[PDB]
Amino acid sequence: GSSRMSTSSLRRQMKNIVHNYSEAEIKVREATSNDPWGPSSSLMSEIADLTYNVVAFSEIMSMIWKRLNDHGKNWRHVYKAMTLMEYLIKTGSERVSQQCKENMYAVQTLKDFQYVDRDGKDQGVNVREKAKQLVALLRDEDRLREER
């Protein structure tokens, strides 16, 4: 320069901050399964703050529906998917609850999702009642249905 001498050589830097906040797909996943380690502050609260948006929201409930219908061997992903679908439906946003009513068959498909391998133990109940709960709160009483 003039009086000082640059010391930090440095080479090149990456891009900049993405103006399109789109990191929900990662939160939802790490939220329905924390096998590994990482930050432990409030991942669920993050996926909800994303529902408010318009993109991240669809990427959130979407990944939540897939892990919600896992196979009949490890419902662990399903139970975790119910916590993210129930948390977002509340603080997440008003759009996360509307989708739950439009996809009630998906949240109810878990109440019947029962499997214990050819011969194992019946431990897939925690998830059975879980899915039933998400639908109970989102709809406690009904005003006479009407399906032909």
CATH of the domain at 46: 1.25.40.90
User: Cα–Cα distances in Å, from 94 out to 51, 90, 99?
Assistant: 9, 8, 9
Number of domains in the chain: 1
Look up the domain containing 102 and give its range.
1-148
The residue type at 122: D
139 appears as a binding residue in the annotation:
no
Which SS3 state, helix, strand or coil, does residue 143 take?
coil
20 appears as a binding residue in the annotation:
no
76 appears as a binding residue in the annotation:
no
In angstroms, how far is CA 32 from the centroid of its own chain?
6
What number of other Cβ atoms are within 10 A of residue 15's Cβ? 5
The experimental technique behind this entry is NMR
130 appears as a binding residue in the annotation:
no
77 appears as a binding residue in the annotation:
yes
* Closest by Cα among 49, 74, 65 to 105: 65
The residue type at 114: Q
* Closest by Cα among 110, 144, 115, 142 to 128: 110
